[PDB]
Amino acid sequence: CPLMVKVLDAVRGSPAINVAVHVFRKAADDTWEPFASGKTSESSDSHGLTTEEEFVEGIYKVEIDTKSYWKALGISPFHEHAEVVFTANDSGPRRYTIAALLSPYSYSTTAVVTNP
Amino acid sequence: LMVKVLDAVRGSPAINVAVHVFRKAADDTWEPFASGKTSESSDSHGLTTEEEFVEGIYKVEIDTKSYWKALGISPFHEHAEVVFTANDSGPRRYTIAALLSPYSYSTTAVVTNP
Amino acid sequence: PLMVKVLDAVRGSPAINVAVHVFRKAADDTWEPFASGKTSESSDSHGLTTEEEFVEGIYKVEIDTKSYWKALGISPFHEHAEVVFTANDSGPRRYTIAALLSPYSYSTTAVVTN
Amino acid sequence: PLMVKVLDAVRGSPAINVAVHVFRKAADDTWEPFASGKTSESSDSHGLTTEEEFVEGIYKVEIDTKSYWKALGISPFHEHAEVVFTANDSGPRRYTIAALLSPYSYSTTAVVTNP
Numbered sequence: 001c002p003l004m005v006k007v008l009d010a011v012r013g014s015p016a017i018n019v020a021v022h023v024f025r026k027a028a029d030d031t032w033e034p035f036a037s038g039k040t041s042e043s044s045d046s047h048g049l050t051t052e053e054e055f056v057e058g059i060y061k062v063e064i065d066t067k068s069y070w071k072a073l074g075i076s077p078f079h080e081h082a083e084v085v086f087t088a089n090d091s092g093p094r095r096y097t098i099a100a101l102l103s104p105y106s107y108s109t110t111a112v113v114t115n116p
Numbered sequence: 117l118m119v120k121v122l123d124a125v126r127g128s129p130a131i132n133v134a135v136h137v138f139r140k141a142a143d144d145t146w147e148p149f150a151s152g153k154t155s156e157s158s159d160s161h162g163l164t165t166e167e168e169f170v171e172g173i174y175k176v177e178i179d180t181k182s183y184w185k186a187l188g189i190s191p192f193h194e195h196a197e198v199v200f201t202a203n204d205s206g207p208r209r210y211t212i213a214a215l216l217s218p219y220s221y222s223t224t225a226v227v228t229n230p
Numbered sequence: 231p232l233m234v235k236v237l238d239a240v241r242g243s244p245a246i247n248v249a250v251h252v253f254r255k256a257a258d259d260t261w262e263p264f265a266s267g268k269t270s271e272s273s274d275s276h277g278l279t280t281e282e283e284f285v286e287g288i289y290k291v292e293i294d295t296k297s298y299w300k301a302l303g304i305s306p307f308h309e310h311a312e313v314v315f316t317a318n319d320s321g322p323r324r325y326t327i328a329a330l331l332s333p334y335s336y337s338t339t340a341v342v343t344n
Numbered sequence: 345p346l347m348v349k350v351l352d353a354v355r356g357s358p359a360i361n362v363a364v365h366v367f368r369k370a371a372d373d374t375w376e377p378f379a380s381g382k383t384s385e386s387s388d389s390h391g392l393t394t395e396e397e398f399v400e401g402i403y404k405v406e407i408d409t410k411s412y413w414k415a416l417g418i419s420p421f422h423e424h425a426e427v428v429f430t431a432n433d434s435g436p437r438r439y440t441i442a443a444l445l446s447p448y449s450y451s452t453t454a455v456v457t458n459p
Contacts, residue, residue: 011354013342013421013448045233045274045326047341059194078225078356080173080199086192101222101339103446105356108222108337110330111192113242116273122442125240127307127334127456161455192242213351215444215453217332219242222451224444226390227356288423307429307454309402314423330451337444337451340421 002055004097006048007040007064015047016040016102018072020065023051025058032061048099055088055096064100066107078105086111117169117202118211119176120162121154125189129161130154130216134179137165140172149174162211169210171203176212176223184218192219200225231284234291235277235328236269238298244276245269245331248298252280255288264289284317284325291315295331307334315340345398346431346439348405349391350383353446354416358390359383362412366394369402378403391440398439400432405441413447420447427452 003023007016019040024032036051064082071077082100090113097112117137121130137150152163176198184191198212209228214221232252236245248269253261265280293311300306311329326341346366350359362383367375381392405427413420427441440455 008339008341010339010446010449011418013340015341015343042343047343078198078200078227079223080201083197083199085194085197087194089190101446101449103353103449105227106222106224106351106353106444106446108220108449108451109193110220110237110239111242112219112237112244112276113192114244114271114276122453122455124332124335124453127454129455189240213444215335215442215451217239217330217335220239220330222337222444224351224353225356226351226358305433307427307456308452309428309430312426312428314426315421316423319419332453334456335451335453337449338422339449342421342448 001050001052002093002095003036003051003053004048004095005040005050005062005064006097006099007066008099008101009069010101010103010106015042016066016069017042019069020063021049022063024061024063026060035060054093057091058088059085060088061085062098066100066102069102070104075104079107082107082109084109084111090115117167117174118162118164119152119154119178119214120211121178121214121216122161124215124217125187129156130183130214131156133163133183135163136177136179138175138177140174146175169202172201173199174202175199178214178216180216180221183216189218193221196221196223198223198225231324232265232280232282233275233277233324233326234269234293235326236293236295237328237330239330239332239335244271245295245298246271246276249294250278251292253290253292254285255290261290283322286318287316289315289317291327293329295329295336298331299333304333308336311336311338313338313340345437346379346394346396346403346405346441347391348381348383348394348407348441348443350407350443350445351390352412353444353449358385359412359443359445360385363408364392364394365406365408367404367406369404375404398432398436401430402428403431404428407443409443409445409450412445418447422450425450425452427454429454
């Protein structure tokens with residue numbers, strides 16, 4: 001797939017399941033146009049959310065509802081959410097894996113961009 | 117509110133990194149609050165503003181793109197953000213530690229009791 | 231059963247032809263080879279996968295990160311990257327060890343399932 | 345010349361009283377002890393203060409992360425966290441080793457400055 005979003009819980013060492021993910025595209029005038037939306041689930045290596053649509057050139061935003069993940073576990077976390085804002089600047093076809101590693105007071109975000 | 121930024125490509129503090137700050141408006145839009153850029157002097161590896169930080173959802177934007185570009189690297193992210201609620205239980209002491217590579221970053225909050 | 235992912239944080243790609251050696255602990259400062267090989271990017275499996283199943287115990291994963299960076303004219307801080315951990319304390323599990331490499335930094339994460 | 349700083353990414357605080365053991369490689373390729381410390385938080389110095397003078401050679405810093413997490417009732421993934429590195433290879437440097445800890449994850453970074 002052209003986009004893979006993985007969200008990991010670094011305290012449990014597991015995919016963070018039932019996490020809301022919202023992907024957007026920069027529009028003129030600052031507007032963000034919704035591109036994909038979904039919730040994490042698991043089976044095999046696919047412990048994240050995949051879109052089928054490829055990424056033409058632009059600026060994207062991935063929002064991750066990490067506040068609702070922790071609040072479910074009895075934890076009010078530092079971050080109000082995780083956000084990943086990036087350029088898709090190879091105009092030709094690229095694969096994007098975006099991983100978010102979650103703790104109550106920390107997050108980490110990593111991208112892998114490959115050309116198939 | 118202290119913001120410390122480390123460069124994982126160079127093994128150094130991230131020198132001359134732009135750090136902006138926002139306070140949440142009623143209009144769901146973000147009202148500015150402060151700016152700053154990380155200054156390496158004596159012992160300080162980060163940008164510390166001189167604020168009287170009240171309660172409310174605050175935003176920290178780090179300009180990682182301009183930082184990596186100026187070093188001839190085409191980074192992944194536009195920037196690295198921390199959105200958090202600052203003083204929901206009296207005064208608190210905040211260090212945001214950010215660690216930066218062209219394709220990844222982590223932000224950690226260190227909350228001490230003043 | 232064991233997957234090791236090695237990622238280049240500078241380039242945002244799998245770090246390929248990286249040597250990985252896995253060991254089982256045999257006694258004080260004694261390590262038995264468990265499996266080994268090199269990272270290879272075959273699309274979606276970008277890391278090293280081993281057929282061998284874990285029996286209960288302590289395992290060491292050695293990643294030759296220093297060769298990887300030297301082949302790039304970079305003299306990294308770390309001589310290698312090592313992950314030591316206990317396996318199968320509770321039964322038959324799938325382990326994915328990810329290492330994210332930067333010249334002055336490495337970070338390691340583990341996902342353990344079923 | 346050698347400083348080791350530890351952050352707890354679960355509790356959002358310095359990791360206080362984590363043990364740090366530093367070894368030096370020997371001409372027979374073994375690990376001879378070098379520096380002994382648990383991490384301390386007095387003032388805003390949130391790490392471990394190693395005093396000894398650094399020569400050219402290979403060093404191993406071991407952070408006992410398992411003891412740390414077991415004391416908060418968490419069974420962590422890792423047995424420990426180590427950094428191995430060649431120090432002082434181009435002359436006297438100052439090392440700050442920064443460790444960030446969660447139970448199934450950790451990172452180490454070096455801040456390397458010229459005195």
